[PDB]
Amino acid sequence: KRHIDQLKEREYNNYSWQDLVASGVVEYIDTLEEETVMLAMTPDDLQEK
Amino acid sequence: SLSEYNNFKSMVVSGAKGSKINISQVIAVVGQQNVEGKRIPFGFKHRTLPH
Amino acid sequence: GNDLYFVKLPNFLSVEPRPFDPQYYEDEFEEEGRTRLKLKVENNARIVKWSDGSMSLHLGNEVFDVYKAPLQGDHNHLFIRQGTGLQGQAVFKTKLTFRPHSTD
Amino acid sequence: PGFVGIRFCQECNNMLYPKEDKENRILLYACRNCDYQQEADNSCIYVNKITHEVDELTQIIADVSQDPTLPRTEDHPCQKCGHKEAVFFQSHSARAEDAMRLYYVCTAPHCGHRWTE
Ligand SMILES: [Zn+2]
Ligand SMILES: [Zn+2]
Incomplete structure (x- = not known):
């Protein structure tokens, strides 16, 4: 939620996507690297079991 | 389960447009998707999608 | 007293490691030259804390809004190692973990 | 032979x-x-070997245990060290004559046990 709150206050101050990438939250996965990632679709249903 | 007034049935039993398979896909279930007659192939390494 | 006051400024906002004194300052630097003199004139600092929680840098008439990124990848134990004792008598003030990145 | x-x-x-x-x-x-x-x-x-029966079990490698895209079961405890967690997958070898047999690798480092049931 820290990232969501800081992102919601952007354009009041300069928090942006690049900060999300730099902080190590999102990642640029490509097709040849996508062959070894296990990928969910929604955190609300596909992380509980 | 379709009522006598169902407008899909009116257009299927008349033969004007549609088939009972279209009613099945719209209402009950779409079904198996095949490419080249087989189930979806392992496009990735031993799986169909990263998920 | 003992609170984390760590900030990581970029190259074009490098503040002096010592207080500004007339005996330690000299005139050496001059669109090309506009970004050159800004290194040793605008760069003492008062990190303002606002009500929204964010901070900003105040080194003159211009305000740079900063974010205190809590990066847990460089858990360095920042200390004031001044040479008086055996070798760099580091004083344990605060371990640097959060890096504030200022920008225009 | x-x-x-x-x-x-x-x-x-x-x-x-x-x-x-x-x-x-x-x-x-x-x-x-x-x-x-x-x-x-x-x-x-x-x-x-013309029929060419070959032991896929041997070519299994202990390093596969850490693959994140592999199914995991504690329902098949390790035969060697008893560790519950096992990753299971099919032969993965082309030219497999006709098989869907499973191969299991223990999810415990330095056990590295690969076995078949
Ligand atoms: Zn010879
Ligand atoms: Zn084992």
Whole structure:
């Protein structure tokens, strides 16, 4: 939620996507690297079991 | 389960447009998707999608 | 007293490691030259804390809004190692973990 | 039935070729680039499995245990070290004659046990 709150206050101050990438939250996965990632679709249903 | 007034049935039993398979896909279930007659192939390494 | 006051400024906002004194300052630097003199004139600092929680840098008439990124990848134990004792008598003030990145 | 691989000439590290000794009636190995005669100890020269049953279990590697895109079951405890967690997958080998048999690797480091049921 820290990232969501800081992102919601952007354009009041300069928090942006690049900060999300730099902080190590999102990642640029490509097709040849996508062959070894296990990928969910929604955190609300596909992380509980 | 379709009522006598169902407008899909009116257009299927008349033969004007549609088939009972279209009613099945719209209402009950779409079904198996095949490419080249087989189930979806392992496009990735031993799986169909990263998920 | 003992609170984390760590900030990581970029190259074009490098503040002096010592207080500004007339005996330690000299005139050496001059669109090309506009970004050159800004290194040793605008760069003492008062990190303002606002009500929204964010901070900003105040080194003159211009305000740079900063974010205190809590990066847990460089858990360095920042200390004031001044040479008086055996070798760099580091004083344990605060371990640097959060890096504030200022920008225009 | 065995599997006869390559053997190398000690004098020049070139491949050895078999040769019958027509005087003492024994099998020897020879090199085309060197006059190096050494005695064979197998008596078999060439083999070929036509049905070609091969143990995929051996070519399994313990490192697969850490693959994140592999299914995991504690329902099949490790036969060697008893660790519950096992990753299971099919042969993954092309030319597999006709099989869907499973192979299991233990999810415990330095156990590295690969087994089949
Ligand atoms: Zn040789
Ligand atoms: Zn084990």
